[PDB]
């Protein structure tokens, strides 16, 4: 990493402010600095020399005192042996905005000889240099009276050039043949994009470019977007192939933390965070032994909103729900229970000893899938449901794994649908004396009322009535809900199957009547394209400006709606293969 924030390093993201540092400090870690975005501020110091042999550009995106991008003043002591003597800027070149203020530095030399109109590009920027060094020796004879120190290698200056009005403000000479490149913030040493001192936008491996290599590049061999192996990301005004070790990628740029609508993910070494499929995860506190609350009550329910993974446990006691009239507490509003529909994993256990009578199903725990059992509520139980009398079915339609512990479901005299459950399939490991199911609603009653597992479920069982409550189906499924068929030959969405789960076909497939429409999710599996064919792929519109490896690629649609590359010398695209169509 050659970049370091402002408020070892080559680029400075911010202001470089050096004040109060002692005389004997090793200032050599500033030896590699090349460009600084903000301003440069040096005051109240006591060292003798400033060394910037590699500094070339100070962009001055922020000016100090409202006028200056470089501000040096009062770097000396009154009654000790420490003061500034030289500014060793043997390779400094340009300042993009602001002026220069150097004043009241007792023994700073050579500043009167160097012409300031060259570095600063703002003509009417205030540049004042007074009451600075006193008995300064003359500049060296090799340097023609234009140097930074008495040395013979510390004298650049020069660079002053006039300009033709064609190039406007960015040029390297007065002739009409001498306009700088478009991507250059100031002056250049040549017309090329690799000769400019600073870039308007980004510097990649020496050149000034509008944007860094895109993550996706059109490949004329595959007729499709394909990953680019020579990608670079945005870190400030520098294109880098990998963000700093602590950083993460946002879209095409680096950031310390991904925005709340995306979550940091690792994809084979490269760390970038994609947008969340609806909403992003969040961990919240549990309930019980180890938490702050004996139960879930009206004083902790708001903090569980938008939570995805409960590091801990959940207790639903009567006192939290019914309130506590002895110690003034508001009773919990039952319609607020829907905040648990976002929960996916419970680290430890689940304890339910009371539930609202109007809610016969725990459907507020639909998206719950995992109960780890790393901690147990009571006796070795990772799941406890007792004395719930006005409850019909469970409703944990996506619950698939109880990692460890045991299960307690008793005294629920109106609970059905639980009788035919293959508990070996959910709880992992032994079923030798790990099930406590008694005193509920008898099998004899549930079967008579018609409350058994739906015949669409497999031999494992179900959490309740209907299709969307099966553990596993007997044939197909869609959206966690069992079905009899996917929409193969007809239906609202034409679909395909992959290991007994229906997925929607690619939207570019043409809906086929009486025969299969697509084989997989990609557009290379359609039997026939709905609009246009870009090789084997179905596309909405033909390529018209996509970025290729050799250049932008332009194609035209066929009468049979197949895109073909247009001739090598169109620019505005094409409506056909002929030259008349550009």
């Amino acid at each position, epitope marked *: 990493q050659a970049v370091c924030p402002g408020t070892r390093c080559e680029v400075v993201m911010g202001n470089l402010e050096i004040v109060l540092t002692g005389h004997n400090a090793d200032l050599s870690f500033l030896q590699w600095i090349r460009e600084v975005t903000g301003y440069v501020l040096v005051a109240m110091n006591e060292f003798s020399t400033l060394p910037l042999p590699n500094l070339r550009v100070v962009r001055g995106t922020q000016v100090y005192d409202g006028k200056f991008a470089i501000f040096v003043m009062l770097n000396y002591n009154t009654n000790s042996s420490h003061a500034l003597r030289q500014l060793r800027l043997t390779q400094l070149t340009e300042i993009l905005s602001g002026g220069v203020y150097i004043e009241k530095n007792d023994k700073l030399c050579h500043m009167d000889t160097i012409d300031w109109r060259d570095i600063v590009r703002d003509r009417d920027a205030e540049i004042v240099v007074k009451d600075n060094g006193r008995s300064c020796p003359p500049c060296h004879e090799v340097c023609k009276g234009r140097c930074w120190g008495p040395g013979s290698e510390d004298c650049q200056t020069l660079t002053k050039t006039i300009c033709a009005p064609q190039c406007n403000g960015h040029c390297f000479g007065p002739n009409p043949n001498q306009c700088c490149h478009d991507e250059c913030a100031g002056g250049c040493s040549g017309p090329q994009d690799t000769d400019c001192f600073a870039c308007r936008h980004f510097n990649d491996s020496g050149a000034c470019v509008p944007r860094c290599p895109q993550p996706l590049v059109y490949n004329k061999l595959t007729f499709q977007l394909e990953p680019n192996p020579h990608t670079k990301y945005q870190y400030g005004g520098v294109c880098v192939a990998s963000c700093p070790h602590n950083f993460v990628v946002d879209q095409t740029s680096c950031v310390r933390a991904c925005p709340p609508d995306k979550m940091e993910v690792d994809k084979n070494g490269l760390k970038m965070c994609e947008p969340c499929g609806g909403l992003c995860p969040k961990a919240c506190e549990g309930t019980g032994s180890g938490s702050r609350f004996q139960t879930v009550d009206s004083s902790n329910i708001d903090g569980f909103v938008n939570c995805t993974k409960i590091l801990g446990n959940l207790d639903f006691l009567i006192t939290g729900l019914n309130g506590d009239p002895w110690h003034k507490i508001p009773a919990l509003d039952p319609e607020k229970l829907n905040v648990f529909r976002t929960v996916r994993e419970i680290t430890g256990y689940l304890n339910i000893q009371s539930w609202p009578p109007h809610m016969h199903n725990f459907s507020v725990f639909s998206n719950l899938t995992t109960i780890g059992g790393r901690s*147990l509520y*009571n*006796r*070795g139980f990772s799941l406890l449901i*007792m004395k719930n009398l006005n409850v019909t079915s469970l409703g944990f339609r996506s619950l698939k794994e109880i990692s460890a512990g045991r299960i307690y479901i008793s005294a629920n005299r109106q609970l059905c649908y639980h009788h035919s459950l293959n508990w070996t399939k959910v709880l992992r490991g032994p079923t030798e*004396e790990r099930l406590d199911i008694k005193h509920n609603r008898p099998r004899r009653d549930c079967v008579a009322e018609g409350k058994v597992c739906d015949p669409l479920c497999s031999s494992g069982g179900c959490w309740g009535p209907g299709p969307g409550q099966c553990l596993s189906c007997r044939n197909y499924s869609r959206g966690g809900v069992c079905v009899t068929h996917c929409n193969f030959l007809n239906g609202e969405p034409r679909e395909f199957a992959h290991e007994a789960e229906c997925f929607s076909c690619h939207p570019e497939c043409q809906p086929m009547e009486g025969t299969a429409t697509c084989n997989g999710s990609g557009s290379d599996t359609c039997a026939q394209c709905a609009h246009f064919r870009d090789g084997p792929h179905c596309v909405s519109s033909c390529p018209h400006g996509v970025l290729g490896a050799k250049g932008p690629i332009y194609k035209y649609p066929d009468v049979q709606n197949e895109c073909r590359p247009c001739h090598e010398n169109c620019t505005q695209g094409c409506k056909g293969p002929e030259l008349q169509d550009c």
Partner: antibody
Amino acid sequence: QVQLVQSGAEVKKPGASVKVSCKASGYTFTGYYMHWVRQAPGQGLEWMGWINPNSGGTNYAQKFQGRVTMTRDTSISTAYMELSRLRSDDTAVYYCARDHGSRHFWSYWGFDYWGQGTLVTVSS
Amino acid sequence: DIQMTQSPSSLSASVGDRVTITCRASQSISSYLNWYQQKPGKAPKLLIYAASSLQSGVPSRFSGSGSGTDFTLTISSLQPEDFATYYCQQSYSTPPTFGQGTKVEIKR
């Protein structure tokens, strides 16, 4: 005060049946479960079963399940245990103990009050 | 049946010593283990329930510790009323089980 009084010593022949009582006084009889534990002479302890003195629910141990019938009489606050199909290895001192929890699910099954012990000698 | 193992079988200690008996569970039993004292020929007395909780009436020298598999009943400064036989009881499984019993004896 809480006090559990059992019946006198019994002497049975191999094959008979014995029904030992346990008269409770000093607490709500239907509030706490009643445990039965026997101890062979010079041996360890052995748990046989508990009784819910309010509902009548039983929970016998697998070793004794089938030849032990424990009941209750709330009108006089007395618990009974009838061990039939006797053997010479059933000779022990049979204690009756009280569960220390009114709500049994949160009880730790610790016996805070015991009876005086009833000796039941079964020999030919 | 989660068979309990008490150690040691017998123990010879004098008045004023710190003694330590160990009740080991066959499987993990969380914290559901009790301790009892039985005078010879008399009904057992409840000392510590719930691994550590001291029963009301029992002196402060009686203390229990441990969880899961290895439990420990530690009493400091033996007293003349404390020379008897001690059993540990598990209440985790549906069939409870007692230990073989440690018998502390007066050193002489």
